[PDB]
Amino acid sequence: VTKKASHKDAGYQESPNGAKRCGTCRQFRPPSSCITVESPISENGWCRLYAGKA
């Protein structure tokens, strides 16, 4: 598999985008990890280049 972006390049943030958070993006890594963000993660975050994209 290929690499994801890093959190600041992916536009990670401090509170959710409506219904979308670190858990309702697409491929957040349960229970407490990601692939775009260096883990452990804030579930309230979200990013603009979330894992599970192309």
Which CB, 3 or 50, lies closer to ligand SF4?
A: 50
d(CA 16, CA 2): 26
Q: Rounded to the nearest whole angstrom, what is the least distance from the CB of residue 30 to ligand SF4 in the complex?
A: 10
Positions in the binding site for ligand SF4 (CB under 6 A): 7, 12, 22, 25, 28, 34, 36-37, 41, 45-47, 50-51
Q: Rounded to the nearest whole angstrom, what is the least distance from the CB of residue 45 to ligand SF4 in the complex?
A: 5
d(CA 9, CA 32): 21
Question: Is 34 in contact with 3 (CB distance < 8 Å)?
Answer: no
